[PDB]
């Protein structure tokens, strides 16, 4: 005879839990804050199986993954899940980019590799000259 856990053995919220979500966490018309939405995936070079079912996706706050690029040169602590090699590779390129923003690491990257360029490895192409 447990009236609390009686109403939620299911997948959705119980009527007691829906009341808590409505008053405390639900963003309403009263809330002068925009709904948080993650941006969708969109390819520039592939056919996009369009996920454009929401034309309302600008009455909301699009979570930016690049607004804090300057903070992304060093690891962002950790609670219980350590950083991955995928994440460390992303931090390394950001650290590389900030080193190159100071003019230094940009030209030297091309310089240190050119003695190692074995032509048998590459598909030779014509230097069109659109690199500044």
């Amino acid at each position: 005879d447990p009236k609390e856990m009686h109403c939620h053995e299911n997948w959705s919220l119980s009527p007691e839990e829906f009341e808590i979500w409505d008053r405390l966490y639900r963003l309403k018309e009263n809330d002068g804050v925009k709904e948080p939405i993650l941006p969708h995936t969109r390819f520039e070079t592939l056919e996009n199986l369009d996920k454009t079912s929401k034309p309302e996706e600008e009455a909301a706050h699009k979570l930016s993954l690049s607004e804090w690029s300057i903070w992304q040169s060093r690891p962002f602590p950790t609670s219980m899940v350590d950083h991955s090699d995928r994440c460390y590779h992303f931090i390394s390129v950001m650290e590389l980019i900030e080193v190159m923003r100071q003019e230094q690491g940009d030209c030297s990257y091309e310089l240190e590799l050119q003695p190692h360029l074995r032509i048998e490895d590459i598909h030779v192409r014509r230097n069109k000259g659109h690199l500044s």
């Binding site: 959705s12 948080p36 993650l38 899940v81 090699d85």
Partner: protein
């Protein structure tokens, strides 16, 4: 669920994930002595919903890759194979 009349199920699951996110965030707030904003909890709920979509797609493709229709513990281990803390915890709890 497929291509028509499934927005209601999405809204109900969104609300359930939002409630669970708020309940877990309150315990994190007790542990660290901070308070979470409404919009912060809504953002974490949205992140969790899309990460659940990623997890479902990964698990289904991993199960189908091994000529299986049932998602088992090996699919969850292959999902958590990337982080040492996330992989060994699974081995700590999937076996248990």
């Amino acid at each position: 669920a497929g291509g028509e009349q499934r927005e209601l199920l999405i809204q109900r699951l969104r609300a359930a994930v939002h409630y669970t996110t708020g309940a877990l965030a309150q315990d994190v707030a007790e542990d660290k002595g901070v308070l979470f904003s409404k919009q912060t909890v809504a953002a974490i709920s949205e992140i969790t919903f899309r990460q659940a979509e990623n997890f479902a797609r990964d698990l289904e493709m991993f199960a189908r890759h091994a000529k299986r229709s049932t998602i088992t513990s090996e699919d969850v281990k292959l999902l958590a194979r990337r982080s040492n803390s996330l992989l060994k915890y699974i081995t700590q709890k999937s076996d248990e």
